[PDB]
Amino acid sequence: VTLQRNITLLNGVAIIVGTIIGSGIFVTPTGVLKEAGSPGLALVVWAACGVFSIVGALCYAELGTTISKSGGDYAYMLEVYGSLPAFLKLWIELLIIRPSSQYIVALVFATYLLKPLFPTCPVPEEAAKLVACLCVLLLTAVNCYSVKAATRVQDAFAAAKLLALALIILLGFVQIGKGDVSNLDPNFSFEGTKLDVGNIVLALYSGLFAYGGWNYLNFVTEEMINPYRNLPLAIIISLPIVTLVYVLTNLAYFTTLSTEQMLSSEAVAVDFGNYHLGVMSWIIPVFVGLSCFGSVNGSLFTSSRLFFVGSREGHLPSILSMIHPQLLTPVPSLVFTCVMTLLYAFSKDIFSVINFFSFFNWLCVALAIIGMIWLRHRKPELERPIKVNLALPVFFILACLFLIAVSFWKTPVECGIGFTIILSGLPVYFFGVWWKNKPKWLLQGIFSTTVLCQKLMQVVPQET
Amino acid sequence: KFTGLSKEELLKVAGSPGWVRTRWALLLLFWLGWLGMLAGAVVIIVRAPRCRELPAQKWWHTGALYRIGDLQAFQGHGAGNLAGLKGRLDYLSSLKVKGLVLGPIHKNQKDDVAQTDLLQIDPNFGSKEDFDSLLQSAKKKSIRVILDLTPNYRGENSWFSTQVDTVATKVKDALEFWLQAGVDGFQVRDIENLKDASSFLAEWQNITKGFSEDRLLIAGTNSSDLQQILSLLESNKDLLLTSSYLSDSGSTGEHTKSLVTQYLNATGNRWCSWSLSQARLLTSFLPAQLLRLYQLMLFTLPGTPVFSYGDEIGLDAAALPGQPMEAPVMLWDESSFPDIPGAVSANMTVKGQSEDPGSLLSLFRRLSDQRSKERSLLHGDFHAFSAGPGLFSYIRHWDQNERFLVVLNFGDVGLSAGLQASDLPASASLPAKADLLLSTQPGREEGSPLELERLKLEPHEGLLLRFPYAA
Numbered sequence A: 001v002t003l004q005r006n007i008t009l010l011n012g013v014a015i016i017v018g019t020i021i022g023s024g025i026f027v028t029p030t031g032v033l034k035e036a037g038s039p040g041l042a043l044v045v046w047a048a049c050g051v052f053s054i055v056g057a058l059c060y061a062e063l064g065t066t067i068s069k070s071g072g073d074y075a076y077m078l079e080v081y082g083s084l085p086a087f088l089k090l091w092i093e094l095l096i097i098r099p100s101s102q103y104i105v106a107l108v109f110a111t112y113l114l115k116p117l118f119p120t121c122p123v124p125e126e127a128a129k130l131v132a133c134l135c136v137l138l139l140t141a142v143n144c145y146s147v148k149a150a151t152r153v154q155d156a157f158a159a160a161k162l163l164a165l166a167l168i169i170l171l172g173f174v175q176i177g178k179g180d181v182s183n184l185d186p187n188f189s190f191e192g193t194k195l196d197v198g199n200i201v202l203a204l205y206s207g208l209f210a211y212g213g214w215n216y217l218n219f220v221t222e223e224m225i226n227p228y229r230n231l232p233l234a235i236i237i238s239l240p241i242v243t244l245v246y247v248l249t250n251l252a253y254f255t256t257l258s259t260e261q262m263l264s265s266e267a268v269a270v271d272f273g274n275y276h277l278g279v280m281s282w283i284i285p286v287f288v289g290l291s292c293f294g295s296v297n298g299s300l301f302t303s304s305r306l307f308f309v310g311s312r313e314g315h316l317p318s319i320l321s322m323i324h325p326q327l328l329t330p331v332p333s334l335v336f337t338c339v340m341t342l343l344y345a346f347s348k349d350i351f352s353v354i355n356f357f358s359f360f361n362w363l364c365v366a367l368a369i370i371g372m373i374w375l376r377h378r379k380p381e382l383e384r385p386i387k388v389n390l391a392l393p394v395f396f397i398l399a400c401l402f403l404i405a406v407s408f409w410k411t412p413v414e415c416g417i418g419f420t421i422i423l424s425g426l427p428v429y430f431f432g433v434w435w436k437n438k439p440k441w442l443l444q445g446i447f448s449t450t451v452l453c454q455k456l457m458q459v460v461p462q463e464t
Numbered sequence B: 001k002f003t004g005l006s007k008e009e010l011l012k013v014a015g016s017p018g019w020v021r022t023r024w025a026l027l028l029l030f031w032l033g034w035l036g037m038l039a040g041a042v043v044i045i046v047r048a049p050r051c052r053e054l055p056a057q058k059w060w061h062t063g064a065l066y067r068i069g070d071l072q073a074f075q076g077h078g079a080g081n082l083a084g085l086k087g088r089l090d091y092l093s094s095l096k097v098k099g100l101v102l103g104p105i106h107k108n109q110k111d112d113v114a115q116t117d118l119l120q121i122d123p124n125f126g127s128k129e130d131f132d133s134l135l136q137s138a139k140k141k142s143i144r145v146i147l148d149l150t151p152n153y154r155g156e157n158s159w160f161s162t163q164v165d166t167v168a169t170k171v172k173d174a175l176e177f178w179l180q181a182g183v184d185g186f187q188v189r190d191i192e193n194l195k196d197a198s199s200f201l202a203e204w205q206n207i208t209k210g211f212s213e214d215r216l217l218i219a220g221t222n223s224s225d226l227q228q229i230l231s232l233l234e235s236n237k238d239l240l241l242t243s244s245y246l247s248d249s250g251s252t253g254e255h256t257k258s259l260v261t262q263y264l265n266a267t268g269n270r271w272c273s274w275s276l277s278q279a280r281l282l283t284s285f286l287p288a289q290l291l292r293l294y295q296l297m298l299f300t301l302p303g304t305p306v307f308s309y310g311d312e313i314g315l316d317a318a319a320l321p322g323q324p325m326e327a328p329v330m331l332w333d334e335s336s337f338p339d340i341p342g343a344v345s346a347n348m349t350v351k352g353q354s355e356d357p358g359s360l361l362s363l364f365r366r367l368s369d370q371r372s373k374e375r376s377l378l379h380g381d382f383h384a385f386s387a388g389p390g391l392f393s394y395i396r397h398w399d400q401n402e403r404f405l406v407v408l409n410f411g412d413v414g415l416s417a418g419l420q421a422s423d424l425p426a427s428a429s430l431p432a433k434a435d436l437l438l439s440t441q442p443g444r445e446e447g448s449p450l451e452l453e454r455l456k457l458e459p460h461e462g463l464l465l466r467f468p469y470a471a
């Protein structure tokens, strides 16, 4: 009774495309304009974040072919640095990182779905919260039913994302096709290029939100068919597509609108559709709403498989990683990753949890690649189907150190608050994993609630 | 297997009836809770009120207009033609003005009617191939150009005290000719000397709107009484009309409040034009301590504000000798006025005031940025309320957007606010505290929330407090 591999090459391309292309190409093409000023340097920022994500994805592709276990960026830290750093990453990825991301994308789905009922006004907050909590509860029940249904949802909505962005691109091409230039001039595109770079870094920090999720196929290996071919082939097909679509979307945003109406807009795609369609412009909010529907599916699919593997190493309770037989789906882990996401519907302002843990989110990717280089000069004989040309990891390590160095010298305010979360996660580690010689007051109670949930969900343990 | 059963004994135990009933009941309970939450979201969405439709504004509803009377006195000697006007079109984009009322540029000799043609440009301002070049260069910066067509702008009677209707047929023939060249509106001044004025204005309005609905027609009187203004506006009502209605006071705030509220109540809350003259500066009527207080009022009242050139720097024709008051010289830099080299200071120039963050031009730029952006100042609703002896306090509020509260102290001695509101509808009532966006005098923290019961106004001070849509 195992997890019964189903993921093809095209399903992986769908997972990466559908998880990456979510809200950030619709709710962010401004922040880079308000901290970059000129429309040329914003395109420079988007292209730079694209190259950064591509080189990091190639390093993770050769990592995932080297080690080849699920729970990527966690299994690698487990094979390199031991038990305690792997638990600390797993702990704050179970507490904060995944249930905030899924809730934020579900909320953006609900807001841009209810936008055509409230055209120039605000959507009521307990009506959008209660639809965000329906999206997660429906996708966690679709994922608990079958795996191939959950992969059919993902590539249907990945096709919908591309057909919704291609319409915006071809609407921009016929706007440049009628010979008028509000922006994108040859010599008039750099007026207000904010220099100093001091304000720029903040920018590079804003354009990387739309590229996040490129390392999510590494969580769901051991479920691909022929992974040594189909993991890097699904990465290098998916990710250069995104960095091209992300610049052909922003420059088409720049042909129609000007810099004074973009900076005075809270929904750039809605203001694009209002000018280029008029009536029958309601399809743009519902198509940027369905864009955020396929990004919660692809991130609930991998978050369950992360806590699956976190329990096989003894870092979690063993009720997780118990497969339901004849459905062959991790039900008690999907219930957990749904309940943790629905717990963030009590937060009023959780958009500022991004600055709290942006330093550790890149410190893990730095630490994984330092250990990747360290493993090559320590165990220099494994089956390596794809080896990377070096000094791209050397570039990426110091680039992630440059991205973490602006968290301590520019805005060091909340990083000390964020560090206390990890050091409060440490005694949880000691109590849960390290404290053996356990008394029978607690161990039999643990066995009793585990067999209770086991009889309730009808799940059996794994077994090669 | 690890801290639980294995497959065999689990399917042995947990396959009994009752244990199947519990999990089927829990699945049914899950789906009933989901269909309860969906209907809850539906009846929350339906019980949200509505939100209002935008009122389909024109381009002159969006910001201010800028009157340039004499073209030579705007630049200076030498480059006092239409080609030199093209170089200033980014300073006008700094002011965020939406329109430009160019002065009369046609060929007017003097009081001879037959030697006055409105279709031909006088050669001292340029030619038509410079004029459409200026028009196409101003269309790039989102600035519309309005052409003044007052015929006898060099004599004393502007409508030729001789033959009457013949000089109006050549205005009727010139509207069509200049509208195809691409101007965005027209202005006629001094129409208290025009015979059958209310009949001619309706004909010219129907000609101008019969071309496009993006076309303006401004009229100007020297009248100051309300019943003579309302007589011009009873047939045609899309007409902008600048006059000297607010010019009279220069004084206490009760009279200004009564003038604004009586005009807005008599005209039925239509789109009006707020001004202090038809061709004159603000310093012709106001002392120099009341310019910042009037600039805050003219940008926050429900209409189109119309200014002359030099009103942003406080230009004064009675501060420099040897200049006509109908056309003073624009002080761009320290070398602008050539006679008496040293009479012009540094705080009286454009570039000397573009550096000070507490200047007069720095107030104009902030207010003109706030007016053309916020929906409560674009098409909000006006409500003035009662206050202390010498105050003018009002509120703008559109639908659910960020509300605005303007408090003006026209008095000479200081006093408190005393904002006994008690009169506004529930969508715009006062909170217990509000922000501070702006003040016309230094000595206050711009951004920090005050509370609106210990509000104190020092002499000639105005405040621009702000508060959102709440209870």
Ligand SMILES: CCCCCCCCCCCCCCCCCC(=O)OC[C@H](COP(=O)(O)O)OC(=O)CCCCCCCCCCCCCCCCC
Residues within 6 Å of the ligand: A314, A315, A316, A317, A318, A319, A320, A332, A333, A335, A336, A339, A427, A428, A431, A432, A433, A446, A453, B002, B003
């Ligand atoms: C929500 C419903 C989901 C449905 C499925 C049910 C799954 C249950 C979800 C439980 C999630 C727990 C995740 C975090 C667990 C960390 C502990 C751990 O890894 O144990 C492995 C360890 C592995 O046991 P094994 O399964 O026998 O290998 O688990 C345990 O022994 C029991 C741990 C229970 C933890 C309950 C919460 C305790 C929080 C910390 C309490 C304070 C500790 C320090 C005391 C002094 C404080 C100053």
Ligand SMILES: CC(C)CCC[C@H](C)[C@H]1CC[C@H]2[C@H]3CC=C4C[C@@H](OC(=O)CCC(=O)O)CC[C@@]4(C)[C@@H]3CC[C@@]12C
Residues within 6 Å of the ligand: A142, A146, A148, A149, A152, A153, A293
């Ligand atoms: C507009 C949005 C916000 C509302 C929800 C979108 C869809 C209307 C929902 C309704 C139920 C969902 C899915 C429910 C389960 C599957 C069954 C699936 O059939 C199978 O192949 C699996 C069956 C099996 O394995 O036995 C095909 C349709 C699909 C993806 C459904 C497609 C449509 C989904 C995503």
Ligand SMILES: CC(C)CCC[C@H](C)[C@H]1CC[C@H]2[C@H]3CC=C4C[C@@H](OC(=O)CCC(=O)O)CC[C@@]4(C)[C@@H]3CC[C@@]12C
Residues within 6 Å of the ligand: A324, A326, A327, A331, A335, A453, A456, A457, A458, B023, B024, B026, B027, B030
């Ligand atoms: C807070 C936690 C500890 C409570 C967990 C409650 C679960 C969310 C509930 C909801 C519905 C319940 C179960 C209802 C019946 C079973 C058997 C299963 O039935 C089948 O579809 C298989 C039969 C077939 O293949 O024909 C459906 C899913 C499942 C595991 C469900 C798993 C989740 C249960 C225990």
Ligand SMILES: N[C@@]1(C(=O)O)CCc2ccc(OCc3ccccc3-c3nc4ccccc4o3)cc2C1
Residues within 6 Å of the ligand: A019, A020, A021, A022, A023, A024, A025, A097, A100, A101, A104, A105, A209, A210, A211, A212, A213, A295, A299, A350, A351, A352, A353, A354, A357, A358, A361
């Ligand atoms: N690019 C996406 C898109 O839809 O645009 C596609 C899906 C995806 C997957 C992972 C991801 O990692 C973000 C992250 C990493 C470490 C610590 C915090 C956060 C964080 N995520 C947030 C979401 C919303 C508001 C604040 C947030 O802070 C971002 C995105 C967005």
Ligand SMILES: *[C@@H]1O[C@H](CO)[C@@H](O[C@@H]2O[C@H](CO)[C@@H](O)[C@H](O)[C@H]2NC(C)=O)[C@H](O)[C@H]1NC(C)=O
Residues within 6 Å of the ligand: B206, B207, B210
């Ligand atoms: C503007 O005025 C003219 C007349 O002064 C109106 O045009 C007339 O319309 C009727 C009905 O079609 C015709 O029979 C006349 O020949 C027209 N007279 C003209 C063109 O001189 C016109 O309706 C007015 N505009 C508006 C909006 O009412």
Ligand SMILES: *[C@@H]1O[C@H](CO)[C@@H](O[C@@H]2O[C@H](CO)[C@@H](O)[C@H](O)[C@H]2NC(C)=O)[C@H](O)[C@H]1NC(C)=O
Residues within 6 Å of the ligand: B192, B222, B223, B224
């Ligand atoms: C507007 O200006 C005129 C001239 O400065 C004022 O005087 C009028 O002048 C005309 C001849 O040009 C006479 O026919 C009128 O009788 C004059 N008016 C009066 C009241 O005697 C005119 O008064 C000004 N308008 C206002 C409202 O003050």
Ligand SMILES: *[C@@H]1O[C@H](CO)[C@@H](O[C@@H]2O[C@H](CO)[C@@H](O)[C@H](O)[C@H]2NC(C)=O)[C@H](O)[C@H]1NC(C)=O
Residues within 6 Å of the ligand: B265, B266
């Ligand atoms: C200003 O508005 C008020 C009420 O909205 C009008 O005042 C009324 O006028 C009628 C005569 O038309 C009187 O019989 C009422 O007693 C007045 N009521 C009040 C409360 O004053 C007034 O007419 C409007 N102003 C103008 C110029 O029309």
Ligand SMILES: *[C@@H]1O[C@H](CO)[C@@H](O[C@@H]2O[C@H](CO)[C@@H](O)[C@H](O)[C@H]2NC(C)=O)[C@H](O)[C@H]1NC(C)=O
Residues within 6 Å of the ligand: B345, B347, B348
């Ligand atoms: C520009 O600044 C000068 C001083 O730098 C101002 O001159 C002052 O004028 C007032 C009233 O005329 C006098 O009481 C002061 O003594 C003058 N200052 C000095 C240093 O002598 C001038 O008024 C300013 N101009 C404007 C338009 O504000």
